[PDB]
Structure 1
C-alpha cells in the first residue's frame, strides 16, 4: 500500500538578528512543503504467529530553507513484528519514546523551534529519529496503560565514527478523560566540544479532552548533561497548549519556553527562549485541514560551549516572527 501525507504551508518570517542583510536573507515568504510518500505493509509468515510488518516513509518533498527532492526511508523506516498479547517490536529508523511526546503534542502549533531542538545544553538532549534502533511498544494494558521503550545506536556510531548509544523509555496512563505522560532517555559516549558527554533527560506531561470542546496539554522537561572533564550542565523547559474546538473549528494557543542554563551550579545569563503562537484550524474534510498560524520567537543571546567556542542553538540564527497558512491531507 502507498500512503501519503500532503502538507503545504505558506509562511512569511520576519527576522530580527541585528544584521539587516542577514535579516533579509533569512526572512521573507516561503513555501514549506512537508508532503511525503511512503510504503508500508504487513505479512503473515507461514511459520510465525507474530505478523511481519515493514514500512518505508520518504522525507519532506520540499521543506522550506531547503532544496527539492527526498529519498525513500528518510522518515520512519523499519521492519518488525506484532502480536496482540505483547505488542510490537520494530528495528530500523523510528521515533524514540521521548521524542514522540516532545513532538506531539508538545511542539504543535509551531513551538518546535524551542521545545523540539531549541536547546542551550551541551551533549545531546535526546534523539528524535535515529536509524539504528530497536523499539518495543506495549499494548494498551487494560485498554488504559501502555509502555514504549527503545535502545539504539548513536548518531556518529551509525557511520562507524564513534561509540555513542542511547536508550529511552516512556509510559502513558489514560485515566478517563485525561492522559498522563512520563518519559526518559539517556545518551552516552557523546563526543562534542572536545569532551565526551552523558545526557540524562526526563519529561512529565498531561493531556485532556473534554466535551465542552477544550483540550490541553502541558509538559515539564528536565535536561541534565555531564561532561568528561567533570563539568555539569542542567537546563529545563516547558510546553503547554490550550485549544477550544467548536463545530469545524479549532482555536489553539500554545506556549513553550526553555529556561536559563546552569553550568557547574552557576547560571548563564539570558540563555532562555520563549515562544507563543496562535492557530485557527478548519476541518475542511475528514481527511484534511486548513490552518493559519502566527508565532513570536524570543531566542537566547548565546552560550560558549565547553570548547572556548560558541555552541549552536535554534536561536543562533536570531529572533523572528512568523505568519503562515497551510494545508495537510492524509491518505
Structure 2
C-alpha cells in the first residue's frame, strides 16, 4: 500500500535552464542586425524519463531513456517532443560497461561539446567551421555506442557507428564511425578522438570526412582548472577536391568558495582547398563567465562573448557555403540559471 523507490519502473528527471541573452550583431546590414539582435530568452529546460530492468532470463541489465527537447530556445518556437535529446535502449554489465542503441552523442562530439564548447564557444568550435561534407555528427539517431568501463581506474573508450542524416529518412546511404579514448593521469585527463563520415552528399558531390582531436583537461588543488584541444578536419570530394581545416579551443577556470571564474577562447584557422589557403575563412571567439554555485543542484551565471567569423566562401557547386558566420559577427551578454533534478 505504501510506496518505495522500487514501486516505480521509471524516473522523471529534468534540467531547468533559462538564459536571458542580448545579442549585438554587426553583419553589414542594419535591418538584419535589428532582426537577429536584441534580447531573447533561451529556455533550454527539458524533461526526461529513464529506467532499468533486470530481465529474469538475461544477466546484462536493461537500460532505457527518453529525453525531451529544449522547451523554448531562443530563435525557435515553443514546444518540444519526447525523444529529441538522448533517447535509447541498452544493456550494461560491470566487466564490459554499456552498449546503447538509439539517439546518443558521437564520441567525437561529446568531447567537442564538453569541455570545449563551454562557455558559448560553440558557434566557432561546435558547429562552426568551413569544411565541406560532414566534419562529424553531433547527437545522432540510428547509432550503436559502446562505453567501456574505467579500466584500472584510469582508461576508458567510447566507440560508435551509425547511419547518417539522409540514411535515417531512407534518402541516402551516409554513415559514420567514431572512437574516443580518455586517460586519467594525476590531476590530468588526456583525450583523443576520431570520426569518419562516408557517403555524404553535398554540393553535387559525395564526400568522405576524417576528423581527429587531441585534448587535455586539468584540475589542481589551488582552484585552477583548464582544458585545451586541437582539432584537425579533412574532407575529400568525389570530384577529387581535398579540403583541410584545423581548430583549437581552450579554457581557464578559477574556483574559490561558491564562485567559478572562466575565460574561453576558440578558433578555426583558414581553410585550405587543394593545397591553397582560402583567405579570411577563419573564425574566433573569446568568452568570459562568472558562475555562482547557488545550490548543490543549481548555478547562476553571467557571461560575455565576442564572435568574429569568417568572411564567406563558396562550396564546390559555386554557391555560398553556409557557415556559422553567414549571419554575421556578434557579441552577446547573458545571465542564466540551470537547476538539475
| Aligned-partner SS, 2:185 | coil
d(CA) in 2 for partners of 1:125, 1:274: 18
Structure 2 unmatched ranges of 5 or more? 1-10
* 1:93-148 alpha-carbon deviations (Å, 9 max, x no partner): 00000000000000000000000000100000001011000000000000110000
Q: Offset at 1:317?
A: 0.3
Q: Offset at 1:176?
A: 1.3
Of 295, 309, 325, which aligns to 1:315? 325
| Aligned-partner SS, 1:24 | helix
Of 17, 31, 43, which aligns to 1:7? 17
* 1:259-305 alpha-carbon deviations (Å, 9 max, x no partner): 10000000000000000000000000000000000000000000100
| Aligned-partner SS, 1:226 | strand
d(CA) in 2 for partners of 1:12, 1:35: 19
TM-score of the pair, normalised by structure 1: 1.00
TM-score of the pair, normalised by structure 2: 0.97
Q: Offset at 1:215?
A: 0.5
* 1:77-100 alpha-carbon deviations (Å, 9 max, x no partner): 000000010000000000000000
| Aligned-partner SS, 2:83 | coil
Q: Offset at 1:205?
A: 0.2
| Aligned-partner SS, 2:85 | coil
Q: What is the alpha-carbon root mean square deviation over aligned residues?
A: 0.3
Q: Offset at 1:43?
A: 0.5
How many aligned positions are there?
331
d(CA) in 2 for partners of 1:309, 1:21: 24
Displaced runs of 4 or more, over 2 A: none
Aligned 1:1-331 pairs, distance under 5 A: 1-331=11-341
d(CA) in 2 for partners of 1:51, 1:119: 40
| Aligned-partner SS, 1:316 | coil
| Aligned-partner SS, 1:98 | helix
d(CA) in 1 for partners of 2:129, 2:83: 27
d(CA) in 2 for partners of 1:97, 1:204: 12
